Amino acid sequence: REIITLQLGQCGNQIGFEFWKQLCAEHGISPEGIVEEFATDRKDVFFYQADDEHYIPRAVLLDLEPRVIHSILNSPYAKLYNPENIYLGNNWASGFSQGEKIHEDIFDIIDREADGSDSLEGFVLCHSIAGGTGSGLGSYLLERLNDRYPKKLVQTYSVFPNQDEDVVVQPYNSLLTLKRLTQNADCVVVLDNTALNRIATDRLHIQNPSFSQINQLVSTIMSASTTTLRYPGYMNNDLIGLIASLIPTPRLHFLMTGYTPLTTDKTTVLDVMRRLLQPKNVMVSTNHCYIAILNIIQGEVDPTQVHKSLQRIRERKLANFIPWGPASIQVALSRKSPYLPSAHRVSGLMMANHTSISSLFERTCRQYDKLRKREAFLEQFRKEDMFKDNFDEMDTSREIVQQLIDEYHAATRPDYISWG
């Protein structure tokens, strides 16, 4: 139904602003907010139908000691949306404590926008893992959304800012935030800026404006993930129906992302299918195995040899699903939206529950573990000591994430007829 977007952190506000400019260009709206004569799809999933004959977008901007938010403000896409939800450290404990002291009025901002809608389906959060101002604050307020709203769904869009390796307090913040993402979130979309940056430097000659083009990539992935909700389709035009199928267990809910065009400067669905299974197309990268795969393909093709393509991929015999489960690739087809010129309009995406990310979780675990062993790279700020003098929250996050790694490895194996 109606889904409210919450953006916090500098990186989260940046990718949210890029996404809102993307939907401004996509749908028939001005940079003013008014509906145009090239509007008619559903425009009530992200835009509040306002009383100005303006489809005013539901964009809740929160920040802590803002810098780039002022550069967002002096632009014609910060008066695109203004329903009065615009509001004005570098550690997880410091951001947690600073979010603690000002939680009331921004939670009143959340409450005002929550009753302002006719209906509610989900709160989707723009976040960056250990992004500084976003970290700690986002974990605390994520806990407060899961506490205050048990009837609604929480989605988290999170990126890991790393320029191919690194901050020494970053594994602590990622461990603590990942504990919050495990137990206070319903679905977490995780991306690696290292792999995306390497693919971006490969595909073009972009090396200095890598982050700006990464914003375009994340905006296209976000718009393609919600296109079947924004545009009239058939299935899972709520968030929860889309989220439900990929998750077999509520702790394996971290989804790997895929994207078919490696540059966008006429094929059948068979080619992009056998493409996107292979890890030249995965932008976020024992043998670790998929639990469930969901694919969304958007392009100008003639959709009947999809059953033929499923025949061909089946007996090409590339990939097998999980021992205990009779799982299956789940496939949806949509149209690529007009009002943006794109050569080769075929664009594919996969949303897949993969165990490979467990290794990367263990990678962060190993980093945190060695910094826990040396104890010269926790950097000893007074906010961290005042927040937790015993640092047993790190031990709780560590034991939960180690149970998560064991659950990952047991779900890969047929030890999910047993327990691990």
Binding site: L270, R312, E315
Partner: protein, 345 residues
């Protein structure tokens, strides 16, 4: 002119003695039927009035002469057969379909007809013809799909009526655009396809049973040069590999002659003679005509099957009373190989 059939009111449908004149020869009477059939399938309408005037001229004359009349019917026939040739060669791509017919019938492609034997070895037994029948088509389509060929594999199909030697290949052609291919033509093609399949089937056994170098002399000093089958393995291979290199020439000569003949002629009726010679030459030169010499070749193929079955299980050299079978094999091979050199004398 109009192509009308049943213009006879009892004084596709066949010829009859009451409608056949014998003072006008039979060879022109067949050409009249050909001219009549071809209109319904045509540039005869364009010159039609010219051919009307001739006939009306022939209506006026009080005397009849066979000499003038035969020229008129043959000239009409000439233009009609030319009209058929002009369309089938160019707009229906008859030559490119001949390439497909060659590729799947004379086994001029080898990917499918090697992988099919690799992915099915259960048609050595007798078929119930309702489970095996589904299975051969399934194996065919699955084998094709690995590397490309999303295009065709609509025209060729299998038709099983052991299970390798009662298997057929059911085809399809464009029936309005081709009349040169009927059930009898593809039936002859089915027969030659089955014989070439039999030979390809035994060569798969010969290459599989060959592991003399791979494991049977490698890393082992084996029991060879004490207990061994004298290496008749090498000798049985040559007599069929040589007949089979010969089969390659037997096919390729006729194929080159066909694709040379079709360019020269420009009437469909002459093309019919060329093709009816093509098939008849292929038949007798491959000895598919039942002869004692062909039965000697079939006896050789039976002994090859029986010998490959022993050397498959034998792996490292062993007497398991296999010498009893080997004695029969060397006797029969010597006797029939001697008869292979009385057919040249």
């Amino acid at each position: 002119l109009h192509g009308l059939l049943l213009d006879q009111h009892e004084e596709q449908f066949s010829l009859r003695v009451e409608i056949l004149p014998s003072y006008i020869p039979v060879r022109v009477a067949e050409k009249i039927l050909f001219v009549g059939e071809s209109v319904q399938m045509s540039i005869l309408k364009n010159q039609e009035d010219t051919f009307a005037a001739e006939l009306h001229r022939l209506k006026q004359q009080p005397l009849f002469s066979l000499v003038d009349f035969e020229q008129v019917v043959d000239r009409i026939r000439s233009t009609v057969a030319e009209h058929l040739w002009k369309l089938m060669v160019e707009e229906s791509d008859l030559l490119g379909q001949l390439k497909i017919i060659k590729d799947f019938y004379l086994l001029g492609r080898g990917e499918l007809f090697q992988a099919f034997i690799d992915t099915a070895q259960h048609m050595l037994k007798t078929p119930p013809t309702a489970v095996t029948e589904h299975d051969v088509n399934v194996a065919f389509q699955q084998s094709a799909h690995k590397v490309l060929l999303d295009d065709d594999n609509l025209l060729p199909l299998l038709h099983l009526t052991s299970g390798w030697a009662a298997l057929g290949l059911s085809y399809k052609v464009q029936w309005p655009l081709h009349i040169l291919f009927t059930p009898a033509v593809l039936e002859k093609y089915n027969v030659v396809f089955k014989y070439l399949l039999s030979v390809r089937r035994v060569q798969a056994e010969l290459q599989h049973c060959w592991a003399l170098q791979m494991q049977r002399k490698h890393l082992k000093s084996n029991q060879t040069d004490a207990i061994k089958w004298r290496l008749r393995n090498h000798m049985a291979f040559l007599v069929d590999n040589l007949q089979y290199y010969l089969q390659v020439d037997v096919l390729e000569s006729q194929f080159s002659q066909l694709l040379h003949q079709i360019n020269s002629t420009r009437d469909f009726e002459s093309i019919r003679l060329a093709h009816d010679h093509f098939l008849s030459n292929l038949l007798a030169q491959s000895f598919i005509l039942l002869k004692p010499v062909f039965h000697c070749l079939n006896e050789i193929l039976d002994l090859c099957h029986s010998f490959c079955s022993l050397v498959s299980q034998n792996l490292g050299p062993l007497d398991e009373r296999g010498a009893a079978q080997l004695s029969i094999l060397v006797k029969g091979f010597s006797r029939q190989s001697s008869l292979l050199f009385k057919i040249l004398s």
